[PDB]
């Protein structure tokens, strides 16, 4: 009934490869809903390069842990039946399901093929650095164990335009297939960032365009998805992602939420992409991720008044999926920009108690990351989810007027009893700030849901209250 939406990435990079994750998800459904989670982003659910693959080394998009391929039947997360069972549990508990979609490349080809290719400048793929010669690339996919179930489409080298490994001479190089063009338009870092890893798909081919559109529809129907999380889209021709998304919404009866991962610490680049998409999807707020990271790294000297500056949520709140960390930013991973424990509570309060943006909770933060001795922050997050789910409603007032202490308020809405809140925090010494929470809340006494400050704040006759916060901390006051 108008409840704020909250997404949760249900996995972390170092999850154990025990094949019991879908089952865990299934048993956690009710608890997650009660906690305030309304949507779950599941990891790539199809067969990857190997059983332990996190899912991005995608081998067979039609094998959801159902066929014996790549050395295993189940994926790292479990079997097809356990996933379907988990999804059913999510639906019955009012939780939307977003499926991760990996279409930029394929990995784990069954055999190599001889291909004329040229080496290109890694920092400028538009420039060849060698003449054309024949290499042996891993491009042949037969999906043997699937027996053509669902689809008899087979992949070959002519469906791709590049790889980063030559099996003939056993060397690593960024290869562009001779007589093939890099996809366009794509991100321009390194000149043309079409190629990332694995066997890079060339969408110029109509057969490729149709195959992935048809697979998408099949995947959507098979799992009854409510949306998707589009992987590495800055490496995929923009025109195609738009075509694909429009195609899926046309084939599915249910609404489909779409959030793309355009990984770049540049809001303008993201806005450019959204213009190209005619704003038909949201994008993860990568700049905000880096804002949080810069703050975490610098300490109190960071000017909190700029915490949201340059972020996507700041400019287009309706098209931004906000987050603090993910499987790519956690320690040791490729896009590391981990927010330390001290600043993490402030970052989560920022995405969970504000009116703009569609916030996402990271599994690694919620349950911790054992591999790196990172504690579970479930207690802290649940209090902020309680705030979001039951109190973050109504007109918002911002107070980013001090370099250390900042905050904002929500007047609450008649639709939700006792809703309304006041968030105040400091990345340096503690302090206080008078903020307006709505004259309709006069006479109420508000207390901190996080327990970080025992102050009791009574709202005066004009609807103003003075809220307190300790140093390097965050408090969220509500009429509890
Ligand atoms: Na690409
Ligand atoms: Na981060
Ligand atoms: Na500061």
CB count in 10 Å sphere of residue 102: 21
Binding residue numbers for Ca(2+): 104, 194, 202, 235, 300, 404
CATH number of 394-480: 2.60.40.1180
Cα of 390 vs centre of ligand 3, distance in Å, is: 30
What is the number of the ligand closest to the CA of 197?
Answer: 1
Q: Which position has the token pair 């014996």?
A: 68
Known catalytic residues?
Answer: 231, 261
CB 112 within 8 A of CB 167: yes
- Phi, psi of 449, rounded to the nearest 5 degrees: -60, -25
What is the number of the ligand closest to the CA of 406?
Answer: 3
Cα of 315 vs centre of ligand 2, distance in Å, is: 20
Positive or negative, the Cα torsion across 293, 33, 369, 54? Answer: negative
- Establish whether the linkage from the previous residue to 166 is cis, with ω within 30° of 0: no
What is the number of the ligand closest to the CA of 204?
Answer: 1
Closest CA to 4 of 436, 412, 305, 380: 412
Cα of 302 vs centre of ligand 3, distance in Å, is: 4
SS3 category, 210: helix
DSSP string, 141-192: B--GGGTTSS----B-GGGEEEEEEETTTTEEEEEEETT----SS---TTS-
Cα of 475 vs centre of ligand 3, distance in Å, is: 16
CB 183 within 8 A of CB 236: yes
Q: Long-range contacts for 404-407 (Cβ within 8 Å, ≥24 apart)?
A: 404/300, 404/304, 404/428, 404/429, 404/431, 405/304, 405/430, 405/431, 405/432, 405/433, 405/469, 406/304, 406/305, 406/307, 406/433, 407/433, 407/435, 407/467, 407/469
Rounded CA separation 20/86 (Å)? 11
CB count in 10 Å sphere of residue 17: 17
CB count in 10 Å sphere of residue 342: 12
What is the number of the ligand closest to the CA of 192?
Answer: 1
* Topology adopted by domain 1-103+206-393: TIM Barrel (3.20.20)
Number of residues that make up the chain = 480
CB 90 within 8 A of CB 216: no
Rounded CA separation 197/360 (Å)? 27
Rounded CA separation 236/123 (Å)? 18
Instruction: State the alpha helices, DSSP H only, in 178-337.
Output: 206-223, 238-251, 267-276, 286-298, 312-315
- Phi, psi of 278, rounded to the nearest 5 degrees: 60, 35
Rounded CA separation 35/22 (Å)? 19
DSSP state of 18: S
CB 476 within 8 A of CB 387: yes
Positive or negative, the Cα torsion across 232, 236, 239, 242? Answer: negative
SS3 category, 111: strand
SS3 category, 64: coil
Cα of 76 vs centre of ligand 3, distance in Å, is: 42
CB 154 within 8 A of CB 141: yes
Structure tokens at 454: 């025992």
Q: Which residues pair with 227 in a beta bridge?
A: 98, 257
DSSP state of 480: -
Q: What separation, in Å, do the N-terminal and C-terminal C-alpha atoms of the chain show?
A: 21
Name 275's Cβ contacts closer than 8 Å, sequence gap at least 6.
Answer: none
Rounded CA separation 138/112 (Å)? 4
Q: Is 420 left (phi over 0), alpha (psi -120 to 50) or beta?
A: left
Positive or negative, the Cα torsion across 400, 401, 405, 408? Answer: negative
Please give the class, per CATH, of domain 104-205.
mainly beta
CB count in 10 Å sphere of residue 441: 23
Q: Which position has the token pair 């990172």?
A: 374
What is the number of the ligand closest to the CA of 196?
Answer: 1
Binding residue numbers: 104, 194, 202, 235, 300, 404
- Phi, psi of 181, rounded to the nearest 5 degrees: -105, 150
Q: Which residues pair with 7 in a beta bridge?
A: 39, 360
What kind of experiment solved this structure? X-ray
Q: Is 148 left (phi over 0), alpha (psi -120 to 50) or beta?
A: left
Q: Judge residue 113's burial from the number of C-beta atoms within 10 Å of its C-beta, 0-12 exposed, 13-18 middle, 19 or more buried.
A: middle
Cα of 431 vs centre of ligand 3, distance in Å, is: 12
CB 469 within 8 A of CB 453: yes
Name 455's Cβ contacts closer than 8 Å, sequence gap at least 6.
Answer: 447, 448, 467, 468, 475
Cα of 94 vs centre of ligand 1, distance in Å, is: 35
Cα of 198 vs centre of ligand 1, distance in Å, is: 10
Q: Judge residue 7's burial from the number of C-beta atoms within 10 Å of its C-beta, 0-12 exposed, 13-18 middle, 19 or more buried.
A: buried
Cα of 194 vs centre of ligand 1, distance in Å, is: 4
Rounded CA separation 227/249 (Å)? 9
Q: Which residues pair with 155 in a beta bridge?
A: 141
CB 179 within 8 A of CB 116: yes
Name 373's Cβ contacts closer than 8 Å, sequence gap at least 6.
Answer: none
CB 399 within 8 A of CB 411: no
Resolution of the PDB structure in angstroms: 2.1
Domain ranges of the chain: 1-103+206-393, 104-205, 394-480
Closest CA to 304 of 358, 352, 255, 343: 343
Q: Looking at 337-441, which runs of residues are DSSP E strands?
A: 358-362, 396-399, 405-410, 421-426, 431-436
Structure tokens at 396: 């918002």
Rounded CA separation 401/406 (Å)? 6
Rounded CA separation 10/367 (Å)? 10
Domains 1-103+206-393 and 104-205 share a fold: no
CB 368 within 8 A of CB 325: no
CB 69 within 8 A of CB 58: no
């Amino acid at each position: 009934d108008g409840l704020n939406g909250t997404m949760m990435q249900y996995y972390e990079w170092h999850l154990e490869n025990d094949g019991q994750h879908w089952n865990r998800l299934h048993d956690d459904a009710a608890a997650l809903s009660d906690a305030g989670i309304t949507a779950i982003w599941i990891p790539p659910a199809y067969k990857g390069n190997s059983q332990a693959d996190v899912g991005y080394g995608a081998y067979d998009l039609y094998d959801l842990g159902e066929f014996n391929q790549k050395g295993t039947v189940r994926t790292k997360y479990g079997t097809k039946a356990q996933l379907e069972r988990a999804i059913g549990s999510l639906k019955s508990n009012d939780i939307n399901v977003y499926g991760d979609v990996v279409m930029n490349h394929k990995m784990g080809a069954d055999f190599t093929e001889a291909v004329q290719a040229v080496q290109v400048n890694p920092t400028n793929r538009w420039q060849d650095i060698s003449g054309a010669y024949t290499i042996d690339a891993w491009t042949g996919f037969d999906f043997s164990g699937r027996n053509n179930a669902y689809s008899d489409f087979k992949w070959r080298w002519f469906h791709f335009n590049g790889v980063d490994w030559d099996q003939r001479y056993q060397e690593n190089h960024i290869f562009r297939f001779a007589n093939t063009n890099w996809n366009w338009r794509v991100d321009e870092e390194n000149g043309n960032y079409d190629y990332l890893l694995g066997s890079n798909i060339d969408f110029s081919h109509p057969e490729v365009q149709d195959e992935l559109k048809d697979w998408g529809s099949w995947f959507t129907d098979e799992l009854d998805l409510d949306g998707y999380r589009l992987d590495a889209i800055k490496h995929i021709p923009f025109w195609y992602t738009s075509d694909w998304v429009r195609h899926q919404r046309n084939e599915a009866d249910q609404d489909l939420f779409v959030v793309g991962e355009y990984w770049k610490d540049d809001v303008g680049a993201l806005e450019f992409y959204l213009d190209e998409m005619n704003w038909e999807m949201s994008l993860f707020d990568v700049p905000l991720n880096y804002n949080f990271y810069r703050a975490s790294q610098q300490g109190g000297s960071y000017d909190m008044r700029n915490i949201l500056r340059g972020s996507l949520v700041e400019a287009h709140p309706m098209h931004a999926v906000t987050f603090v960390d993910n499987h790519d930013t956690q320690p040791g991973e490729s896009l590391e920009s981990w927010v330390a424990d001290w600043f993490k509570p402030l970052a989560y309060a920022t995405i969970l108690t504000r009116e703009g943006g569609y916030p996402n909770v990271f599994y690694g933060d919620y349950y911790g990351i054992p591999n790196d001795n990172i504690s579970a922050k479930k207690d802290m997050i649940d209090e902020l989810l309680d705030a979001r789910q039951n109190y973050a409603y109504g007109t918002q007032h911002d107070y980013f007027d001090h370099w250390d202490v900042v905050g904002w308020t929500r007047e609450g809405s008649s639709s939700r009893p006792n809703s309304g809140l006041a968030t105040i925090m400091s990345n340096g010494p503690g302090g206080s700030k008078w903020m307006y929470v709505g004259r309709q809340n006069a006479g109420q006494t508000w207390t901190d849901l996080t327990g970080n400050n025992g102050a009791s704040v009574t709202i005066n006759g004009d609807g103003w209250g003075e809220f307190f916060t300790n140093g390097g901390s965050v408090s969220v006051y509500v009429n509890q």
